[PDB]
């Protein structure tokens, strides 16, 4: 029963939600190895934990930059939520801490790299390939939404492939716990639902829209709405017109028509039967949802690895100092972190 697992899952989440773990490690417990990517106010590095020899992904945020970009509440959201959740297809926090200048979030390291890198290289996925990944996103969103969490940044850039070829959703900078509607203009242009673009209050339905964009991009090799500038893209999103490649199966087209539905009363995930509309759709008929959660299904692509701490599935970025001021920055703003 999906109902029973989710009931326990919520009991587990609330306890950590109301009493967040805090200051569970320190910088010099970690050997910094390599940068796996960059963000506006920080970055993510491969590091090794000296005590265990375990490798981890460490998100390093510059407190001053966080404040400048008005991402204080959002970053508190990220840490508070990540420390509380636990699901196979999410990178949850193993440790978090802060020092004078930076915030730090340590999560399980995914050696396979981003879906983005592989999708772009190979061009496009087969429908079974794309269905294997979609199922894991369907289940994660089921989990998150039951906890009153909206994710708000689904894209291949945020999906890491693990050693078994399964996905981990990562980067929760825009994730929020909200009952009812919210108004923040956030996310990535290609993946924004029309509600967001038209400055309406919206809810978790925007995640199901973004699932529709992902599945399309995975199966097509490009997104359903693209252009050179964001404003050309929003023009296309609101218009309510998507063209599917001729190789798209009839079942896939029908699924996507129902995910990429501007009409909220008609959009799958947002209806009275919730996620089952998606789960019991014909395109997923072959999917064994339990086997997928248990990781019993054979992944259509297993990443190349040569020992632990291997980074050949990630791009090269310029390595930069982590400087720790002798003076505490932004102590009040990040007191609860």
């Amino acid at each position: 029963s999906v109902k029973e697992f989710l009931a326990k899952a919520k009991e587990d989440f609330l306890k950590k939600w109301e009493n967040p773990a805090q200051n569970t490690a320190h910088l010099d417990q970690f050997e910094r190895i390599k940068t796996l990517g960059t963000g506006s106010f920080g970055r993510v590095m491969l590091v090794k934990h000296m005590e265990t020899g375990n490798h981890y992904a460490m998100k390093i945020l510059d407190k001053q930059k966080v404040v400048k970009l008005k991402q204080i509440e959002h970053t508190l959201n990220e840490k508070r939520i990540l420390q509380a959740v636990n699901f196979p297809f999410l990178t949850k926090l193993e440790f978090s801490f802060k020092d004078n200048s930076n915030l730090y979030m340590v999560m399980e390291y995914a050696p396979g790299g981003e879906m983005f890198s592989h999708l772009r290289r190979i061009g496009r996925f087969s429908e079974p390939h794309a269905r294997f990944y979609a199922a894991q996103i369907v289940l994660t969103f089921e989990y998150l939404h039951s906890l009153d969490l909206i994710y708000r940044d689904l894209k291949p850039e945020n999906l890491m492939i693990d050693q078994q070829g399964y996905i981990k959703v990562t980067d929760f900078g825009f994730a929020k716990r909200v009952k009812g509607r919210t108004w923040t203009l956030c996310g990535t242009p290609e993946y924004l639902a029309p509600e967001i673009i038209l400055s309406k209050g919206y809810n978790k339905a925007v995640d199901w829209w973004a699932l529709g964009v992902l599945i399309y991009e995975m199966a097509a090799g490009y997104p359903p709405f693209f252009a050179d500038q964001p404003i050309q893209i929003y023009e296309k999103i609101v218009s309510g017109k998507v063209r599917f490649p001729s190789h798209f199966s009839s079942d896939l087209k029908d699924l996507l028509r129902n995910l990429l539905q501007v009409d909220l009363t008609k959009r799958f995930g947002n209806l009275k039967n919730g996620v089952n509309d998606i789960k019991n759709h014909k395109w997923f008929a072959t999917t064994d949802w339990i086997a997928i959660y248990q990781r019993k299904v054979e992944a259509p692509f297993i990443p190349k690895f040569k020992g632990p701490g291997d980074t050949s599935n990630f791009d090269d970025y310029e390595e930069e100092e982590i400087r720790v001021s002798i003076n505490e920055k932004c102590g009040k703003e990040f007191s609860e972190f």
Partner: peptide, 20 residues
Amino acid sequence: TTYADFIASGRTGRRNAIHD
């Protein structure tokens, strides 16, 4: 082709999040 238009576009790389 749509593929060719995509590949020729300025948005085949890592896409950044928006804000206000």
